[PDB]
Scaffold this active site. Structure first.
Site, PDB file in Angstrom:
ATOM      1  N   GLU A  30       0.754  -1.245   0.000  1.00  0.00           N
ATOM      2  CA  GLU A  30       0.000   0.000   0.000  1.00  0.00           C
ATOM      3  C   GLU A  30       0.790   1.304   0.000  1.00  0.00           C
ATOM      4  O   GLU A  30       1.533   1.594   0.938  1.00  0.00           O
ATOM      5  CB  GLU A  30      -0.961   0.014   1.196  1.00  0.00           C
ATOM      6  CG  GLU A  30      -1.801   1.281   1.254  1.00  0.00           C
ATOM      7  CD  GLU A  30      -2.635   1.401   2.510  1.00  0.00           C
ATOM      8  OE1 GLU A  30      -2.181   1.002   3.609  1.00  0.00           O
ATOM      9  OE2 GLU A  30      -3.750   1.921   2.385  1.00  0.00           O
TER      10      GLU A  30
ATOM     11  N   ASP B 219      -5.823   2.347  -2.192  1.00  0.00           N
ATOM     12  CA  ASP B 219      -6.541   3.199  -1.250  1.00  0.00           C
ATOM     13  C   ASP B 219      -6.751   4.494  -2.025  1.00  0.00           C
ATOM     14  O   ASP B 219      -5.798   5.239  -2.269  1.00  0.00           O
ATOM     15  CB  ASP B 219      -5.685   3.449  -0.016  1.00  0.00           C
ATOM     16  CG  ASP B 219      -6.397   4.275   1.031  1.00  0.00           C
ATOM     17  OD1 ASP B 219      -7.184   5.168   0.670  1.00  0.00           O
ATOM     18  OD2 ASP B 219      -6.152   4.046   2.225  1.00  0.00           O
TER      19      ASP B 219
ATOM     20  N   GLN C  34      -9.726   0.756  -0.819  1.00  0.00           N
ATOM     21  CA  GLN C  34     -10.166   1.451   0.383  1.00  0.00           C
ATOM     22  C   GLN C  34     -10.614   2.830  -0.054  1.00  0.00           C
ATOM     23  O   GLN C  34     -10.127   3.361  -1.056  1.00  0.00           O
ATOM     24  CB  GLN C  34      -9.044   1.570   1.410  1.00  0.00           C
ATOM     25  CG  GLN C  34      -8.711   0.260   2.106  1.00  0.00           C
ATOM     26  CD  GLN C  34      -7.478   0.384   2.963  1.00  0.00           C
ATOM     27  OE1 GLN C  34      -6.480   0.951   2.532  1.00  0.00           O
ATOM     28  NE2 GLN C  34      -7.532  -0.149   4.180  1.00  0.00           N
TER      29      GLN C  34
ATOM     30  N   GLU D  87     -12.082   3.152   5.185  1.00  0.00           N
ATOM     31  CA  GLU D  87     -11.067   3.607   6.118  1.00  0.00           C
ATOM     32  C   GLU D  87     -11.068   5.123   6.187  1.00  0.00           C
ATOM     33  O   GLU D  87     -10.320   5.799   5.480  1.00  0.00           O
ATOM     34  CB  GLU D  87      -9.703   3.081   5.658  1.00  0.00           C
ATOM     35  CG  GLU D  87      -8.553   3.378   6.607  1.00  0.00           C
ATOM     36  CD  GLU D  87      -7.242   2.857   6.067  1.00  0.00           C
ATOM     37  OE1 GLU D  87      -7.091   2.880   4.832  1.00  0.00           O
ATOM     38  OE2 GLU D  87      -6.365   2.440   6.862  1.00  0.00           O
TER      39      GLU D  87
END
Ligand SMILES: [Mg+2]
Ligand SMILES: [Mg+2]
Length: 260
Positions: A143, A178, A204, A240
């Site tokens: 990530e 993300d 995310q 998130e």
């Protein structure tokens, strides 16, 4: 759809961690994710997952000493044996909790240090994680983190994450897309979601630019969801974000998109 997973390290923080699984189920989530489960026994978490009929979509390898400025040991030269220990423990938890994937944290690069040396070490640690996880049919995620969230982290762009995975050369390693970090650093989310479909195993979301609820901000998430459907994304979308106020008070977006 999509399939949403509540991130218990960010959401439902009004209550102790162990109580967040029930809170997520009460809200309607079928899956959850979080950062670090290590301060709790696998038995403790497993019981909450089963009790609430929840799927554990993802979690991270340990951060090391957060107060010493660490955010991962896998990219740190001379800490390889500790990184492997972190990776092995994550596997133990992933097996016991029936979790298909783990995000192996890289690390922060100290000022003056050579980032290339850290990158080389990270690639070897990811290969180690990949080889340990493969026999169990599990995968490893990478990530990218934006600088506003983690200054001096090894890599911040989705393209850096993608290049690292390409060099790792493993069938069970993918990036963790993300969209909060992606929009902060790269932009062109359609290009990432569509043209790199198959290269990200997890997604995310969070509202831009303050990372709160995903039903407002510069990114039109409902439109992104249509894109995910188009490309046939079959994974989970981790939510998130830091609730603007009380977690429950900001869940209107969830009821709308899940009820549709
Ligand atoms: Mg994230
Ligand atoms: Mg850019």
């Amino acid at each position: 759809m999509p399939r949403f997973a509540a991130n218990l390290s960010m959401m439902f923080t009004e209550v102790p961690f162990i109580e967040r699984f029930a809170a997520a189920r009460k809200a309607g989530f079928d899956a959850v994710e979080f950062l670090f489960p290590y301060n709790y026994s696998t038995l403790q978490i497993q019981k909450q997952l089963e009790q609430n009929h929840l799927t554990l979509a993802l979690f991270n390898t340990a951060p090391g000493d957060i107060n010493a400025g660490e955010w991962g040991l896998s990219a740190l030269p001379g800490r390889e044996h500790e990184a492997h220990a972190d990776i092995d423990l994550a596997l133990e938890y992933a097996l016991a909790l029936n979790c298909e994937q783990v995000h192996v944290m890289a690390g922060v690069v100290p000022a003056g240090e050579d980032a290339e040396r850290y990158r080389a070490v990270f690639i070897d640690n990811i290969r180690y994680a990949a080889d340990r996880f493969a026999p169990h049919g599990k995968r490893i995620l990478v990530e990218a983190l934006s600088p506003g969230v983690k200054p001096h982290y090894l890599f911040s762009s989705q393209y850096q994450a993608l290049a690292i995975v390409e060099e790792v050369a493993r069938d069970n390693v993918f990036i963790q897309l993300d969209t909060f970090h992606a929009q902060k650093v790269d932009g062109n989310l359609t290009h990432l979601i569509r043209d790199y479909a198959g290269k990200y195993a997890h997604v995310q979301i969070a509202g831009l630019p303050d990372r709160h609820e995903p039903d407002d901000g510069e990114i039109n998430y409902p439109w992104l969801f249509r894109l995910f459907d188009e490309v046939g994304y079959q994974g989970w979308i981790g939510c998130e974000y830091k609730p603007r106020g009380l977690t429950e008070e900001g869940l209107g977006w969830f009821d709308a998109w899940r009820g549709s």
